[PDB]
């Protein structure tokens, strides 16, 4: 849930400060890349898969968005097309339809 994600955000920030202190790097200027380097050094792992190795990232990157429940505390879904089951897909379809209507009213490099 959103509160859980916020708690993970705080925990990750605190762990980032711990890592910055451990490596002696200025926590204020301590970046994600620096965190990456330090964690790699501190937890030497020899797995071939980049996914099977340890990780300490922001919760945003870490967790799967898992579609974010889609209904707030009240229980009202956020997306008006929510009950379709493919809310983002149908939102994009609706947007493209609107753009096509607008264009209709007015009037070897890629793939």
């Amino acid at each position: 849930t959103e509160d859980f994600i916020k708690k993970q955000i705080e925990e990750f920030n605190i762990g980032k400060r711990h890592l910055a202190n451990m490596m002696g790097e200025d926590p204020e200027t301590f970046t994600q890349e620096d965190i990456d380097r330090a964690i790699a050094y501190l937890f030497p792992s020899g797995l071939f898969e980049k996914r099977a190795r340890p990780v300490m990232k922001h919760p945003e990157q870490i967790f799967p968005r898992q579609r974010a429940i889609q209904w707030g505390e009240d229980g009202r879904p956020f997306h008006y097309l929510f009950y379709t089951g493919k809310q983002s897909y149908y939102s994009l379809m609706h947007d493209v339809y609107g753009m096509l209507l607008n264009l209709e009213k007015h009037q070897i490099g890629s793939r």
């Binding site: 379809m93 493209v96 339809y97 096509l100």
Partner: protein, 85 residues
Amino acid sequence: KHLKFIARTVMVQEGNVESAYRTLNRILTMDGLIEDIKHRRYYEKPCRRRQRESYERCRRIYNMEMARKINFLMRKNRADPWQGC
């Protein structure tokens, strides 16, 4: 006892006997004479004739209805006017 050459006679046009014969055979088929000849080569018992005629009428009506339905619904084949939805 009728006059000769007045019945089922077609004058060949410019000697295209092939075309004239094709026209004559078309005439015979349209009037059903070929049907009669090839059916009368043997005797169809009255029960079989009744069954065959009923089947032919049913198939004719079914085909007419199917063709009418297909023609009626063909107009909807036009490209989708609301594509993307």
